[PDB]
Swiss-Prot record, chains A, B:
Residues that coordinate or bind an alpha-L-fucosyl-(1->2)-beta-D-galactosyl derivative: 161, 173, 231, 254
Catalytic machinery residues: 231 (nucleophile)
Catalytic activity, as annotated: an alpha-L-fucosyl-(1->2)-beta-D-galactosyl derivative + UDP-N-acetyl-alpha-D-galactosamine = an N-acetyl-alpha-D-galactosaminyl-(1->3)-[alpha-L-fucosyl-(1->2)]-beta-D-galactosyl derivative + UDP + H(+); an alpha-L-fucosyl-(1->2)-beta-D-galactosyl derivative + UDP-alpha-D-galactose = an alpha-D-galactosyl-(1->3)-[alpha-L-fucosyl-(1->2)]-beta-D-galactosyl derivative + UDP + H(+)
Effect of residue 142 to T/V: Alters substrate specificity so that both UDP-N-acetyl-D-galactosamine and UDP-galactose are utilized
Protein name: Histo-blood group ABO system transferase
Glycosylation site positions: 49
Organism expressing this protein natively: Homo sapiens (Human)
PTM comment text: The soluble form derives from the membrane form by proteolytic processing.
One annotated GO biological process: carbohydrate metabolic process
Full protein segment contained here: 65 to 346 of 354
Top-tier EC class: transferase
The organism's taxonomic lineage, starting at the top: Eukaryota, Metazoa, Chordata, Craniata, Vertebrata
Localization terms from the record: Golgi apparatus, Golgi stack membrane; Secreted
Record note on cofactor: Binds 1 Mn(2+) ion per subunit.
EC number(s) from the headed UniProt entry: 2.4.1.40, 2.4.1.37
Amino acid sequence: SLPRMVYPQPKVLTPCRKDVLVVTPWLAPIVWEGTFNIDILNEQFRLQNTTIGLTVFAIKKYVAFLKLFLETAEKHFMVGHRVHYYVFTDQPAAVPRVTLGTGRQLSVLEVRAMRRMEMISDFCERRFLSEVDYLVCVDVDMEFRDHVGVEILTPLFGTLHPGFYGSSREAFTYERRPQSQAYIPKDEGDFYYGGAFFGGSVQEVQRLTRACHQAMMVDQANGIEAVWHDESHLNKYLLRHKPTKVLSPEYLWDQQLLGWPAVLRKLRFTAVPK
Amino acid sequence: SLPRMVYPQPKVLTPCRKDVLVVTPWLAPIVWEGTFNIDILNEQFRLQNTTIGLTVFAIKKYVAFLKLFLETAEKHFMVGHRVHYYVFTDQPAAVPRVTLGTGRQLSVLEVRAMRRMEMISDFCERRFLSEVDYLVCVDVDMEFRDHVGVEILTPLFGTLHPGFYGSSREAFTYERRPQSQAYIPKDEGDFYYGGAFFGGSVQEVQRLTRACHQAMMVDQANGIEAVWHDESHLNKYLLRHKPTKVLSPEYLWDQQLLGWPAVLRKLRFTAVPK
Ligand SMILES: O=Cc1ccc(-c2cn([C@@H]3O[C@H](COP(=O)(O)OP(=O)(O)O[C@H]4O[C@H](CO)[C@H](O)[C@H](O)[C@H]4O)[C@@H](O)[C@H]3O)c(=O)[nH]c2=O)s1
Ligand SMILES: O=Cc1ccc(-c2cn([C@@H]3O[C@H](COP(=O)(O)OP(=O)(O)O[C@H]4O[C@H](CO)[C@H](O)[C@H](O)[C@H]4O)[C@@H](O)[C@H]3O)c(=O)[nH]c2=O)s1
Ligand SMILES: [Mn+2]
Ligand SMILES: [Mn+2]
């Protein structure tokens, strides 16, 4: 139940974006700049006291990415909302000291030096259900450069991989061997989602990561490994279980490889040179 | 968990509609022809064994509208899904004999000759919670002329009133007297929703109808009646509790008064001369 708010009236006969698809054929929004009024969304999610968990793995050399990842998350990720970072690492002492805004906390979870799926679904199942409302699972070799907020939150979301958003499904690098659980035939597929940014309600993310982990274990027992590992299985899952929002490539970009095309009004979350 | 399906690939750089707004600023889809693949939606809702209740009031002379309303609903409303019609009338014997498709049933609920809100929220509360998953509440002086299906289903939806979809908020006929619970100031409002077609999950429709009934009772005690009765209160509710889908005027039209504009690719549910 929202309070009075003053903002520009949406106009039915004036689209927000005419250059891009803003809704999937199963009526999930595709989140692009211009499509949302973040003041309305912030109010809706604050009134539910929403807590967002962000999971990131930083094992071996990748601990070096945490400083920029976390500092930029503090500037751009869910600012104003409750956030709990979960950093999985084999080197807890290498986690940098980053000062956090109010309502935000960080937990370091030590692991031994694809298996992100198992860690999210099984080991942390009960903890996440009790501590957060949504989970966002990302790669660490990345930085936030602009707003990533509650516009992404929904029961289940995937993000368009920046290499494939303009490609036909035949060109998608899905697993194509029928022997793999991740198999998708050439005549199937909506989008190619990136492994580096997905999420949803805790319940839906636990279902996704459990399904992917089970599928990966089946492949392992059959002596096969999907072409792009967890990303192949994520794609098979999201083909069969449609996401309730799809994030545009504003949310998963690589400026070094792909520049800054006119269709991207903002570059929000981007790869860092490894 | 959907089975294999073969259908045209959505294309990120090819919008479905460039002439209209297809998502609200709070990321609810606006349902227009071309935006959805009904095969995907039908599969999703059938896999949940979805049952849709449709409520309609036909009191006094308006029983005369039931024959065309129900016959056309059989041709066009949720075909393939489980449907339960609830016909509220002061003349049960005037309800026409209409042959129903499989999986569809009709119950006649006798009432004595705005108060639709009370009937939906209070008297029928327990029955609807046990019998259906979604409720759709419509005017009876109407006929279906084209598909109205599970693309509309969502926790809470309203429909753009066909008289106002191109209007600025100042021209909306909201209640403007601060003395009424339905009051909306000239600088507020997203859309003008029609009283003749709204719905949602049973829980959300019961919340809406309870809130509107309570607000109407408060107005009554204060000696004020909102300018457009229940529709004024529906508009106040949906301003403060944003719908999770908005139906385009394809879903609530009057061809005699408004013709068949190019922006309407289908006229789905339309007024009948009274
Ligand atoms: O022997 C060389 C190494 C290669 C990774 C390492 C490795 C990886 N990671 C963790 O793992 C994340 C992803 O790794 P990358 O970011 O190197 O590869 P890419 O960007 O191609 O990844 C995509 O494709 C992937 C397919 O499996 C996934 O679907 C992934 O989600 C997709 O985005 C790191 O950000 C980090 O959190 C570590 O924490 N330590 C490591 O040593 S070391
Ligand atoms: O003394 C003359 C009568 C006027 C209605 C009657 C009356 C009404 N109804 C039931 O009520 C429905 C709506 O009635 P209308 O369809 O005549 O009026 P309108 O189209 O302007 O209605 C809009 O504006 C309305 C605002 O309150 C609502 O928000 C409504 O949802 C809006 O769409 C009938 O379809 C029927 O189910 C009856 O069942 N019996 C009756 O005698 S008799
Ligand atoms: Mn990466
Ligand atoms: Mn009417």
